[PDB]
């Protein structure tokens with residue numbers, strides 16, 4: 051019915067946790083060389099995310115909407131460890147070296163996933179741009195949950211500080227999903243069609259990225 | 265750098281405090297219907313400024329650079345009162361209804377100023393976009409000092425919370441000018457030409473804005 055319901059339904063189906071990458075993870079049938087491949091190829095999207103948000107902010111005249119995006123941007127980039135710093139710890143805890151992470155070149159599948167976000171966040175529909183992020187960010191608390199379990203059981207992650215990023219995202223993205231849902235409603239301009247479009251795009255692209263490794 | 269020094273001389277040689285509108289301010293010869301013109305038209309630029317910063321951030325892949333742009337943006341928009349809020353108080357301390365300020369359609373002069381900034385901030389040179397901000401922001405601390413003097417000497421201001429915006433920008437924009445100047449060096453990609461070109465345009469566009477109220 052109402053487009054937000056349909057929007058939440060698109061995610062519930064094309065949801066990353068049901069992609070085979072995470073099935074195998076949840077099961078534990080995933081190689082450490084695989085985990086390192088995923089971790090490094092993710093980095094690009096880890097570094098582009100602040101621009102997903104600021105791409106949207108920069109085209110926005112709704113002052114109350116812009117503050118919520120700031121709050122999101124601040125949670126990711128401001129301070130130390132910011133959300134990028136936290137991913138590097140998961141990279142290193144996997145055994146990839148710092149020079150190896152800086153030397154890694156992101157796949158055409160990594161560049162495609164980020165291009166999908168960037169297409170919507172710089173597109174002409176601010177709601178669709180926010181809907182794009184929601185379709186990724188509203189799945190994270192669950193993935194973060196089930197990811198930690200996999201790390202500690204089948205991957206010998208004994209020190210909690212190694213998966214800080216995930217412990218942190220396990221709650222920060224409950225508030226982000228909630229506030230992005232608000233923003234979509236605030237920035238709607240007869241463009242419900244584009245919100246569902248972005249959702250359809252982002253949930254497929256997510257799946258295409260995870261396809262690359264399997 | 266030399267290119268930063270030429271950048272500072274362009275600003276030095278086209279400084280807002282030498283426009284007739286501030287040579288009048290300083291001498292007392294500014295009307296009060298003139299102050300409400302200014303205060304109200306300035307409100308487009310004020311609400312706009314964060315997107316100048318987020319425009320550059322969204323095209324930038326230098327992580328250290330982006331944190332300096334965030335710092336700036338946080339000072340500007342985060343919390344209560346933020347700089348937009350502080351501008352509202354001062355417009356109201358001028359005698360303007362929250363209702364007329366928000367019914368006010370900004371002048372063509374105002375739209376022109378904001379369009380100039382936005383051209384560079386959406387543009388292709390990240391250092392030029394920063395330098396466009398810098399060509400304005402480096403002037404603010406002194407204008408803010410002098411504008412506070414005028415409000416209190418010739419415009420009978422006594423409540424320090426009215427001109428809080430200028431109080432706040434007298435110190436905050438010292439840090440912003442400093443760090444923008446670092447950003448320019450950090451973002452340079454063989455575009456010193458573009459850095460100076462943005463500077464010439466913005467200093468002259470600010471002058472154009474200052475003239476709409478001089479009749």
Ligand SMILES: [Mn+2]
Nearest residue numbers: 099126133219
């Ligand atoms: Mn994050």
Ligand SMILES: [Mn+2]
Nearest residue numbers: 187222223226
């Ligand atoms: Mn988030």
Ligand SMILES: [Mn+2]
Nearest residue numbers: 313340347433
């Ligand atoms: Mn400011």
Ligand SMILES: [Mn+2]
Nearest residue numbers: 401436437440
């Ligand atoms: Mn500033």
